[PDB]
Amino acid sequence: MNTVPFTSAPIEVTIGIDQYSFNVKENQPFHGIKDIPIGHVHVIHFQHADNSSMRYGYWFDCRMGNFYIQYDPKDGLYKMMEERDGAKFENIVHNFKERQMMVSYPKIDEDDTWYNLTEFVQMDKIRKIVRKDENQFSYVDSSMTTVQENELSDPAHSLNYTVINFKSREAIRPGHEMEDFLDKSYYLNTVMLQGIFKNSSNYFGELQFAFLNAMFFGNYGSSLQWHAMIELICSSATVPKHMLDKLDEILYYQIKTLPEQYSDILLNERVWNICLYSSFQKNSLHNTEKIMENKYPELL
Amino acid sequence: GAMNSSNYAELFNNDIKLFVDDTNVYRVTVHKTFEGNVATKAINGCIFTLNPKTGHLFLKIIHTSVWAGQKRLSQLAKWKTAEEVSALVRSLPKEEQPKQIIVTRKAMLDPLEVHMLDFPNIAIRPTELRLPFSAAMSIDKLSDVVMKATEPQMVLFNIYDDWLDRISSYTAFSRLTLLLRALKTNEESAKMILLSDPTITIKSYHLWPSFTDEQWITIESQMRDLILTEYGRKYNV
Ligand SMILES: COc1ccc([C@H](C)N)cc1F
Numbered sequence: 001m002n003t004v005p006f007t008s009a010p011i012e013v014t015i016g017i018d019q020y021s022f023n024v025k026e027n028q029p030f031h032g033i034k035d036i037p038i039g040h041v042h043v044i045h046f047q048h049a050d051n052s053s054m055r056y057g058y059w060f061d062c063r064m065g066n067f068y069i070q071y072d073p074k075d076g077l078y079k080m081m082e083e084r085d086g087a088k089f090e091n092i093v094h095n096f097k098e099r100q101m102m103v104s105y106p107k108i109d110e111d112d113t114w115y116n117l118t119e120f121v122q123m124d125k126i127r128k129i130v131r132k133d134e135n136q137f138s139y140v141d142s143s144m145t146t147v148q149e150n151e152l153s154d155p156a157h158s159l160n161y162t163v164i165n166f167k168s169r170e171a172i173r174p175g176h177e178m179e180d181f182l183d184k185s186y187y188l189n190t191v192m193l194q195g196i197f198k199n200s201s202n203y204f205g206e207l208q209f210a211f212l213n214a215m216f217f218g219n220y221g222s223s224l225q226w227h228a229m230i231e232l233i234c235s236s237a238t239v240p241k242h243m244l245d246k247l248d249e250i251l252y253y254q255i256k257t258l259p260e261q262y263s264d265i266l267l268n269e270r271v272w273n274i275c276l277y278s279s280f281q282k283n284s285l286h287n288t289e290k291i292m293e294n295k296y297p298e299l300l
Numbered sequence: 301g302a303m304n305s306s307n308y309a310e311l312f313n314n315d316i317k318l319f320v321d322d323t324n325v326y327r328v329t330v331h332k333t334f335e336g337n338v339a340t341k342a343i344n345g346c347i348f349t350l351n352p353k354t355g356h357l358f359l360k361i362i363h364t365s366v367w368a369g370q371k372r373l374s375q376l377a378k379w380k381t382a383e384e385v386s387a388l389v390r391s392l393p394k395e396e397q398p399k400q401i402i403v404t405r406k407a408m409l410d411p412l413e414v415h416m417l418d419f420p421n422i423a424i425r426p427t428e429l430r431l432p433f434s435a436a437m438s439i440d441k442l443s444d445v446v447m448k449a450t451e452p453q454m455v456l457f458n459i460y461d462d463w464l465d466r467i468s469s470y471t472a473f474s475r476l477t478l479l480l481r482a483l484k485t486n487e488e489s490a491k492m493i494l495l496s497d498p499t500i501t502i503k504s505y506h507l508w509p510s511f512t513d514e515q516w517i518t519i520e521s522q523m524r525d526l527i528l529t530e531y532g533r534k535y536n537v
């Protein structure tokens with residue numbers, strides 16, 4: 001069980017850690033989150049009390065280093081930092097724990113939610129979408145735009161998701177125009193899976209990281225990326241059976257975890273009605289279709 | 301974006317452009333089978349591709365053999381239209397290729413766009429106008445070449461005949477749309493109007509009769525009367 005120590009909490013802030021959130025008051029004695037389960041990525045994120053503009057946060061893996069948060073009053077945000085001195089870190093955490101100033105990641109034992117949302121997400125791939133290589137952790141916020149978005153203006157602060165575009169030459173073989181546009185199996189299996197992602201675990205990883213950035217930061221281009229990757233599988237007549245089964249489970253948990261009040265902005269009517277009711281895979285997403293009907297029948 | 305009444309003069313400027321109408325590409329006669337079921341039997345069709353400024357018509361004849369063994373033919377027809385338009389473009393010298401192609405039906409946008417990805421600087425646009433290009437098979441010489449075709453074939457016409465020697469493209473397009481609207485609302489009467497007296501005749505190299513200026517006014521008036529009427533005869537007014 002790992003720990004993220006906070007130098008202090010000088011401004012009133014809502015703090016999220018994965019799917020949970022809590023409130024800290026201005027200058028409340030607060031020095032961290034403890035008992036963070038090892039073996040998953042995590043995200044710690046922030047919504048300031050004064051400015052609900054800009055949700056922001058850090059993706060990180062405790063196995064990759066000792067990380068802490070200290071507020072920066074110049075840039076006006078809680079920043080993640082790495083402490084390279086192993087025993088200085090241990091000694092800092094131990095005093096915070098002894099003084100019982102850290103909140104506890106309240107994982108219910110029955111609860112596989114975070115594993116299910118992050119099954120294929122790996123820090124090494126996160127760092128390739130979010131290029132900032134001096135750090136082992138990755139910053140994201142509400143306003144960051146995607147590479148594809150900027151093709152339609154600071155590159156250093158972009159989300160380098162894999163560009164998907166159904167009306168592109170990448171996607172459409174010369175002389176297979178109608179075929180490839182109505183059955184995207186070529187573009188999914190040969191271009192994306194074999195060529196670009198190498199395997200379906202990497203593809204699902206990006207899909208899951210897009211959904212999480214959309215939900216936690218309301219990153220609009222992440223949401224576009226999540227819907228795009230779903231639609232590409234659903235619009236492909238030929239998909240490995242194991243990918244469809246996993247996709248159903250992937251989506252089931254995303255849909256399960258989405259706040260009921262955010263469904264208007266984060267769910268795309270066309271994509272969902274097409275995937276669930278019109279596409280090749282309309283009959284291959286039983287769990288996802290059942291929860292979508294019982295929870296968001298309005299959208300459909 | 302879309303083409304409508306406000307940006308109407310754009311058609312007649314010096315940017316090369318084509319309309320594409322696909323309404324006669326896939327044509328069927330529906331009939332009963334021996335067993336008392338229904339079956340379609342297709343007949344030859346055509347893509348109506350027209351330069352509105354010059355009047356050059358590229359009439360690609362769609363022979364029924366193209367549908368042999370195919371499923372979802374109404375959807376295939378939109379992609380077949382798009383394949384043939386894109387090939388036409390590719391066959392043209394660069395300086396003759398269109399800067400825009402305007403489809404008369406929005407369902408042609410995706411198929412044409414996908415077939416034209418190599419031409420990123422050719423704009424594919426819809427239109428809000430309700431153009432009567434479906435009545436192009438009411439023109440006898442066009443209907444003839446289509447029905448006689450035993451194979452795929454491209455025939456070139458000027459749908460304005462020699463009109464441009466005397467009138468502007470704007471006026472020539474307006475006469476054409478009026479004749480076509482008339483043929484669409486009541487083909488018989490429109491046709492009765494056109495060849496009223498044998499002194500006026502259709503030249504071998506033309507589609508429409510050789511009318512004087514003064515006779516085109518009389519005809520245009522008779523076509524408007526026809527069109528307003530049928531609108532009465534239809535809504536009772
Ligand atoms: C809150 O956690 C820490 C606070 C301060 C430091 C270093 C000495 N700047 C390191 C930590 F790990």
Ligand SMILES: COc1ccc([C@H](C)N)cc1F
Nearest residue numbers: 017020021022103104105106
């Ligand atoms: C990680 O610490 C917490 C997480 C959630 C809460 C409540 C249930 N919002 C409180 C915490 F102290």
